[PDB]
Amino acid sequence: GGVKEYDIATNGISLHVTEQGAGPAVLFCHGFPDTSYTWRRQMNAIASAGYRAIAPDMRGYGRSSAPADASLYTPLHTTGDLIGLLDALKISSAVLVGHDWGATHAWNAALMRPDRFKAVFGLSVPFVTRGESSVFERMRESGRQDDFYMFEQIRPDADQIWADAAVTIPGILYWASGSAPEGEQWSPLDRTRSLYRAAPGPLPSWAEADYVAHNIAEFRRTGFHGGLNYYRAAEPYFTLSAPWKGAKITQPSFFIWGKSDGLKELYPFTLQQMRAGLPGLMGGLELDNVGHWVQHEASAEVSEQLVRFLRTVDAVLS
Amino acid sequence: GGVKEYDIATNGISLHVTEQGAGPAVLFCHGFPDTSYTWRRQMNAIASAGYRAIAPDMRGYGRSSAPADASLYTPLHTTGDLIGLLDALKISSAVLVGHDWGATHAWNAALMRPDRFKAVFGLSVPFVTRGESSVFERMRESGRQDDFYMFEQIRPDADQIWADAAVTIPGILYWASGSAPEGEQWSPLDRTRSLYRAAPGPLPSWAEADYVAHNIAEFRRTGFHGGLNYYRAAEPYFTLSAPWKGAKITQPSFFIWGKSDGLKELYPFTLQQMRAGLPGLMGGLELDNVGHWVQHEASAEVSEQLVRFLRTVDAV
């Protein structure tokens, strides 16, 4: 027990890594705008269940390299980071845990190297197989150029409108959570209920003060340019993702989101319909009154499902 | 038999497709500077054996689209072409056949989608696992910047060096084949023995005249910019290929190359040793007095090994 930190040189960048425990490897990948610290509770839970929790700051974030160039933030780059990390630690294989962009990048990693990534535990962002159409193209041809939030994030000025971390980190934690009043919650197609609105006072009890303070400090130092580069890379990445047009993830998986997550408006399918695409799905979970920040809003039941999942993966793997 | 031609909209481009036969799908991939016509003898041989031979012009060549941007010619772009081609033909899976750059990209495609590419028959270019360093930095670190031919093909002005297809296409068919006097055959590390030296008179009898005429005609109309973009893409693609750093190809695989191919110099491993990156390798054949153009210099041998390989892959 107890978290250790170090830095790894992998895939042409420097990767800041935190880890805890011993036993089979579990690689945690956070999204926007988060850090490795987002996983401390789950790391501690699975470490006491006999697993090695490994959680880097993803590239763009924290004490990891954050190259200016948005073309460097496709799933090909971060999967190369995760391979080079497993290589550098002499780990043969790991189970993947992802949230937000980490979930998207993790889904891709599992497609690319099932020999190394033996299972995927996805949070908030469901796996959708690659299509004929990128999301940016559909939003444009259906008129949502001024509505689909990702366009606002891709703009170079998004750096500036996020920069005030003391305000924007508590704000996004609040307005994308199940705590914001219904009808006020962030929605991806409404420019008036933005992600970065100031929070209206103290954060709900589920938001651990040590975590909120940690991430405010990280993002006051780093800024948001690298995190926002994940959005800027997604459309250029549609061209390079064509090899996986109909590709499915067959290793065991598991999926959890919150029913109050505004993201759900973009995935109007059931949990039964996620097996087309994820045939190894061992079970899903829709949490009532949880928003986007499931590993904080429902910390204990995320830890719990992850422990149960890992044991089931152990049984399958044996 | 009976060869037919058509175009397919796939992956945001046009792909010119030739095909022959019916049966399990075999997908041919040519390299530089070639066209789909390079496979006609193999296509005909496997059509007679019960297979559907499909041989597109790869992107950058022939009647396929040929965007100027070199960044559009990675294995990611050509695998997307092939997945989209199979989809458009509503074929579930296929065996890959690849030569030269077609082999390198076929290798990578086998890695990316084993669910759609069930076996790999490679010519001239062996699969080696992606490592710590690209061929480009190994050559820089070791002082070969003026020796390694790829640096010259990558130059923008390589478009003009190649352009006289009536000269350069017989040139490379001769100098990179087993018919050139040894010691004078093309070498990837010898400036003085380039690939585009003119031929000394007419081509050896093994170079089928309809094949030679087809390629000269296509490259007179297209130029060589698209093909050369395959070299211009390899180094940037090294950054994008870091997912596959240790990756092995597990599908059944076969490898053929010619003993007199200058490219041997770049792969000093034994074909026993190629099992490391290709654990499902079922055989490797090195051909005496054959150079780079194995499917032409040894057309009947390549054809008979591919029929046998396809029959072994089928029964498994």
Place of tokens 């990837």: B188
Please provide the DSSP assignment of A76-130 as one string. HHHHHHHHHHHHHTT---EEEEEETHHHHHHHHHHHH-TTTEEEEEEESS-----
CA dihedral B135, B138, B142, B146 (to 10 degrees): 30
Q: Give the 3-state secondary structure of residue B274.
A: helix
**Experimental technique used to determine this entry:** X-ray
Please give the residue of chain B at the shortest CA–CA distance from A74. Answer: B240
Chain A residue with minimal CA distance to B105?
A: A243
Task: For tokens 């093309």, name the residue.
Answer: B186
Q: What is the C-alpha separation between A165 and A255, in angstroms, rounded?
A: 29
**What is the Cα–Cα distance from A33 to A162, expressed in whole angstroms?**
10
**Residue written as tokens 């191919």?**
B261
Q: What is the rounded CA–CA span in Å between residue A38 and residue A13?
A: 22
d(CA B27, CA A242): 18
Can you give the resolution of this entry in Å?
Answer: 2.4
Instruction: Determine whether A205 is exposed, middle or buried from the number of CB atoms within 10 Å of its CB (0-12, 13-18, 19+).
Output: exposed
Indicate the DSSP class of residue A198. Answer: P
**Which residue has tokens 């190809």?**
B249
Here the tokens at position B205 are 């009898």
Range of the domain at A273: 4-317
CB A184 within 8 A of CB A178: no
Query: Cβ separation of A83 and B112 shorter than 8 Å?
Result: no
CATH for B170: 3.40.50.1820
Using a CB-CB cut-off of 8 Å, the residues of chain A touching B112 are: 112, 243-244
Place of tokens 């937000």: A100
Give the sheet arrangement for strand B4-10, strand by strand. B4-10, B13-20, B52-56, B25-29, B94-99, B117-123, B253-258, B281-287
Question: Closest Cα of chain B to A46: distance in Å?
Answer: 27
Question: Rounded to 10 degrees, what is the CA torsion of A239, A186, A127, A216?
Answer: 80
Q: Which residues contact A233 (CB under 8 A, 6 or more apart)?
A: A70, A71, A72, A73, A74
Instruction: Give the distance, in angstroms, between the CA of residue A249 and the centroid of all CA atoms in the same chain.
Output: 17
Q: Which residue of B has its CA nearest to A248?
A: B115
Q: How far is CA B43 from CA B33, B49, B295, in A?
A: 19, 10, 11
**Chain B residues inside the 8 Å CB shell of A115:** 247-248
Tell me if chain A has a CB within 8 Å of the CB of B77: yes
Which residue in B130, B105, B107 sits closest to B119, CA to CA? B107
Catalytic residue among B30, B100, B230, B237: B100
- Structure tokens belonging to residue B268: 């000093």
Number of domains comprising chain B? 1
| B12 close contact with A: CB closer than 8 A | yes
Q: Give how far B286 is from chain A: nearest CA, Å.
A: 31
Which residues touch B28 (CB under 8 Å, ≥6 apart)?
B36, B39, B42, B43, B53, B54, B55, B56, B97, B98, B102
Rounded distance between C-alpha atoms, residue B144 and residue B151, angstroms? 10
Q: What's the sign of the alpha-carbon dihedral B114, B118, B124, B129?
A: positive
Q: What are phi and psi of B41, to 5 degrees?
A: -70, -40
Find the farthest-apart pair of alpha carbons in chain A and give their distance in angstroms, rounded: 52
Q: Per the CB < 8 Å rule, is B242 touching A80?
A: yes
Please indicate whether residue A230 is annotated as part of the active site: no
| Secondary element (H or E) of residue A136 | helix A135-141
The length of chain A, given as a count of residues: 318
Distances in whole angstroms, Cα of residue A183 to Cα of each of A168, A176, A186, A261: 20, 11, 8, 12
Q: How many angstroms separate the CA atoms of B164 and B223, rounded? A: 8
| Angle formed at CA B178 by CA B207 and CA B34, multiple of 5 degrees | 45
Is the separation of the CB atoms in B301 and B254 below 8 Å?
no
Q: Is A238 on the interface with B (CB under 8 A)?
A: no
Tokens representing A138 are 């559909």
H or E element that contains A15: strand A13-21
Helices B225-240 and B75-88, packing angle to 10 deg: 110
Which residue type occupies A137? Answer: E
- Where b means 16+ CB within 10 Å and e means fewer, B90-124 reads eeeebbbbbbbbbbbbbbbbbbbbbebbbbbbbbb
- Is A100 part of the annotated catalytic residue set? yes
Q: Would an 8 Å CB–CB cutoff place A243 in contact with chain B?
A: yes
H/E/C letters for each residue in A40-69? HHHHHHHHCCCCEEEEECCCCCCCCCCCCC
Hey, what are B24's tokens?
A: 């399990």
User: Chain A contacts of B87, Cβ < 8 Å?
Assistant: 245-246
Q: Cα-flanking dihedrals φ and ψ of residue B111, to 5°?
A: -65, -45
Please confirm, yes or no, whether A292 is among the known catalytic residues: yes
Report CB contact under 8 Å: B246, A11.
no
Contact between A92 and A23 under an 8 Å Cβ cutoff? The reply is no
